[PDB]
Structures are given as C-alpha cells and as structure tokens.
Design an enzyme around this catalytic site. Structure first.
Site, mmCIF file in Angstrom:
data_model
loop_
_atom_site.group_PDB
_atom_site.id
_atom_site.type_symbol
_atom_site.label_atom_id
_atom_site.label_comp_id
_atom_site.label_asym_id
_atom_site.label_seq_id
_atom_site.Cartn_x
_atom_site.Cartn_y
_atom_site.Cartn_z
ATOM 1 N N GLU A 39 0.836 -1.196 0.000
ATOM 2 C CA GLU A 39 0.000 0.000 0.000
ATOM 3 C C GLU A 39 0.872 1.247 0.000
ATOM 4 O O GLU A 39 0.575 2.224 -0.684
ATOM 5 C CB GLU A 39 -0.907 0.026 1.232
ATOM 6 C CG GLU A 39 -1.606 1.362 1.438
ATOM 7 C CD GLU A 39 -2.299 1.472 2.779
ATOM 8 O OE1 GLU A 39 -2.473 0.436 3.453
ATOM 9 O OE2 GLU A 39 -2.673 2.599 3.158
ATOM 10 N N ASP A 43 1.045 3.722 -3.386
ATOM 11 C CA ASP A 43 0.673 5.127 -3.295
ATOM 12 C C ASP A 43 1.572 5.919 -4.234
ATOM 13 O O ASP A 43 1.096 6.566 -5.167
ATOM 14 C CB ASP A 43 0.842 5.625 -1.855
ATOM 15 C CG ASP A 43 0.373 7.060 -1.672
ATOM 16 O OD1 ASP A 43 1.022 7.981 -2.215
ATOM 17 O OD2 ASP A 43 -0.649 7.264 -0.984
ATOM 18 N N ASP A 106 -7.178 1.476 -0.027
ATOM 19 C CA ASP A 106 -5.821 1.203 0.434
ATOM 20 C C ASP A 106 -5.352 -0.102 -0.187
ATOM 21 O O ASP A 106 -4.154 -0.328 -0.370
ATOM 22 C CB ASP A 106 -5.781 1.103 1.961
ATOM 23 C CG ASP A 106 -5.875 2.461 2.637
ATOM 24 O OD1 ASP A 106 -5.919 3.487 1.920
ATOM 25 O OD2 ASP A 106 -5.901 2.509 3.886
ATOM 26 N N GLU A 109 -4.127 0.383 -3.877
ATOM 27 C CA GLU A 109 -2.741 0.825 -4.001
ATOM 28 C C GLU A 109 -1.787 -0.345 -3.788
ATOM 29 O O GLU A 109 -0.730 -0.414 -4.403
ATOM 30 C CB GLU A 109 -2.433 1.914 -2.968
ATOM 31 C CG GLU A 109 -3.365 3.118 -3.005
ATOM 32 C CD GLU A 109 -2.980 4.179 -1.986
ATOM 33 O OE1 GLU A 109 -2.880 3.846 -0.785
ATOM 34 O OE2 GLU A 109 -2.776 5.346 -2.381
#
Lengths: 219, 219
Positions: A39, A43, A106, A109
């Site tokens: 995650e 990002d 989340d 990602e």
RNA sequence: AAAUAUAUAUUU
RNA sequence: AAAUAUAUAUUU
RNA sequence: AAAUAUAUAUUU
RNA sequence: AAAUAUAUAUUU
C-alpha cells in the site's frame, strides 16, 4: 484459487501468487503478510501514474489548477470508482470489521504494487497495464474538473493559506426584471471579484466561488 | 550551450535541448514558460523513484517506520543535497533574485520530468539513470537521518509509534577495575530484550538500544 | 605523598 | 555543581 | 546529578 | 497550549 477471477479483470497473471494474495489480505486476517507495505509503495506508484496522465492531458497545464484537480484523482473516493471496475472488495481478505470505504482504496494501491513487483519492477509495463484500465476514466475526471470538495471550501482554504483571510460574499440581486427568482452574489477576496447566479443564495455562492478559483490560478 | 556541461554530469544528452532549459528557467527569468508544470510532474515522479528505493532498501518495511524516512527523503532540503552534486545552482537561470534553498528542489523535480519526457517517457530508464547517481546518497540518508538522532532516541520513537509507549533500561552490573569499570544494561520493550556493555551507563544503554532496534526491525 | 588550578573519565 | 581516578602545571 | 532551555517523539 | 520521555546545551 479464485484469484483467476481477479487476474482476468486486471489483465495480468501473477507468477508469484502469495504476492497477489498479500496485497488483498488485510492484517485482521493475517498479521503475518498484509497489504501495509505494498500500500505504501502503491501510493507513490499510482500517484505517479495519475499525475503523469494528468500533466499530459490537463487543459490548463498550471500547478495552480492541477493541485486541486489532483486531489480528487489520488483520493480514496476516486480510487473506489476505479477499484469498482475490479470489484476488488470481493477478493479482499479482511476479518475484523467489514470492508471499509478507505480500506479498499488502500487495497487498490497495494494491488498495483503487487503487479509492479511481480513484473520485475517494470514501471513501463505496469503503468501501461494501468492506463489500459482507467486512463479513460481519469481523462473524464479531468475533462469535467471533478473537485474533491465544494468550491466554497476549497476557495476558503486557498485564501486563508495565501492571505490568512476568508472570502467575502455580498448579495447583488434577488430578482430579475420581470420578477422571477434568481440570486446573484459577488464572491470577493482582496481586490479580486467575481459573479455567480443560482436558484439559491447558496447555489449562487458556490458558483461565484468556482469563478474566484480560476481568477486566482495565475494570481 | 552551457548545458552540455550539465548533461555531462547527468550522463544524459537531451534530444530536445529546450526541455532541460525549460526546467532550468525560473518564473522571474521568463514567466513566459518556466519549470512550473514540469516540476509538478517530477514531483510525483521523483517521489515514486525514492519511495520505491526506500521500500526495497529499508531495514523495517513497516508504515510507521517508512513514513518518517520517506518524509525527509523528499524534503525540499534533501534535494539540494542531491542537486548540488551537479551544481544545479550555476545552471539554473533566474532574472530577479538569487538561488533560494527550496527553489533548487523545485527545479530538481522538473529536471527529471525533463529527462523522463525527453527519454520518451521511459520510467524504467529515467529511474535507472536516477539510481546510477543518487543511489548511495538515498542509501545513506536512511541510516543516519536528517538529524542523525542517537540510538536511544530512535528506539523511543519506534516504540511510541507502534505501541504508544517507551522502552525500559536497567543496570545489571559493573565489571573490571574500580577506575576502568564496565557497565551492563538491559534494554527491554514488552517481551523483547537486549544487553549492552559500555564504559558508562549511557554508552551501554545506547548500544543496547541499537540492538533492540535491530531485533525490532526483524519482527 | 597533601593541596590549589585545569583537562579527561566515571558517578550523583 | 559535588565526589572519585588519572594527567599537567604549581605549592608544601 | 538538579534546575533551566532547545530540539524531537508520543500522549491530552 | 500542556504532560511525559530521549538527546544536547547552559547555570549551579
């Protein structure tokens, strides 16, 4: 494994399965291998993917217009609109607490981090695989101008930032010539002024705000 | 022009020598077209270049630990540390003013957005070049840190972040002669513990700290 | 050897 | 800051 | 070591 | 803003 039902939608077939599951599995399900790491990476990744696409297709290529427009693109709100094309949640592996609006965002990602890492860290390959799924959606979110919050809130935060001052709102018209109902207010900040009409004193103030936002991009 | 000297440092020769210049042009120098949208792109770009390096080269891949490191590794002050290794200052061109501290970072972000694009948007390539240089630096700015906090301090932030609580140090014994004695302290958090030896209690606690740190990153 | 001063180390 | 250890200068 | 200050971290 | 802890400094 029912993984295949995701690889099909994703358009990629993992060589290392545990990897794919990791990005899907939440800590509450297994504190030994969850999407925390992926995650984190995803990002930076997804961000780049989007900012790049944006910078490349943004009508007004100016940081003053990009910053706010990017907010919605890298927001969990949009991430779900993009994740929904995958129905990611179905494949998630959470236990403590049902799926959450942000937990999936989340997971979205973490996933792309998993694909990125499974491709040998081939940015180009991955980035492509990503545009093949959402480039169109992002281009749409950009052609419209989708913002993350109402213009009035954005404008305020902008002014308070730049001038520790909030915008001024004054009513100019509550009626038309033949006595119809239409409101006209002048959103104002410093010496910059704009007009906004609406079926309501509020709807008219959200317009005038939207205008005072453009009239400041280039300062 | 004079850029050939910069290209010698980067190790990359532009096809469109204009880009490099567009990235090196500050608003004041030529508001007509400067490094502003190009920096916006590299912003996300350079971000991804490091967060990626960080994740695969961090002792602890936990969000709580990565977050603070990635915080500095992308600060407008760490970029000057990188950029100065190329005299990016003598190359940029601004009209009114002087090379500000955080401005070297805004042109830096735009410097690679230039390489990236001119490179034909080859992230893989634009990334590998970046590592060819700034790898060792990034690889080091992770161990020490912006302030190079001492071990006891580092551990405390770790424990407080993950468990909202500080560790426990306690003297165990003394060794050697009465003038040249050695201390033995035990570092402990919850159910973990290490032993440190030193010429002084703190020297000993410190060592125990950097030992409980490793044992904690290997969790 | 003791003491004053200072430097270094440890301790409080 | 105080103590103890050592060093250097100094006094005895 | 005590107090004070600066920084940082966590908590209210 | 405050509390606590860690690091250093300063005063003693």
């Amino acid at each position: 494994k029912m993984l295949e039902q995701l690889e099909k939608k994703l358009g990629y077939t993992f060589k290392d399965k545990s990897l794919l599951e990791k990005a899907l599995t939440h800590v509450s399900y297994s504190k030994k291998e969850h999407y925390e790491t992926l995650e984190f990476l995803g990002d930076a990744l997804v961000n780049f993917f989007i900012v790049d696409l944006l910078v490349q297709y943004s009508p007004n290529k100016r940081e003053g217009f990009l910053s706010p427009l990017k907010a919605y693109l890298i927001s969990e709100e949009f991430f779900n609109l993009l994740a929904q094309k995958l129905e990611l949640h179905k494949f998630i592996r959470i236990k403590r607490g049902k799926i959450n609006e942000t937990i999936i965002g989340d997971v979205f990602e973490a996933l792309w981090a998993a694909v990125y890492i499974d491709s040998g860290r081939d940015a180009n390959f991955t980035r492509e695989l990503f545009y093949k799924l959402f480039k169109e959606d992002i281009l749409s979110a950009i052609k419209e101008g989708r913002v993350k919050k109402d213009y009035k809130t954005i404008l305020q935060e902008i002014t308070q930032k730049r001038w520790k001052e909030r915008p001024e709102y004054r009513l100019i018209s509550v009626e038309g010539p033949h006595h119809k109902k239409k409101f006209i207010v002048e959103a104002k900040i410093k010496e910059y002024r704009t007009l906004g009409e609406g079926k309501s004193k509020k709807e008219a103030e959200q317009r005038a705000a939207e205008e005072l936002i453009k009239l400041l991009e280039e300062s």
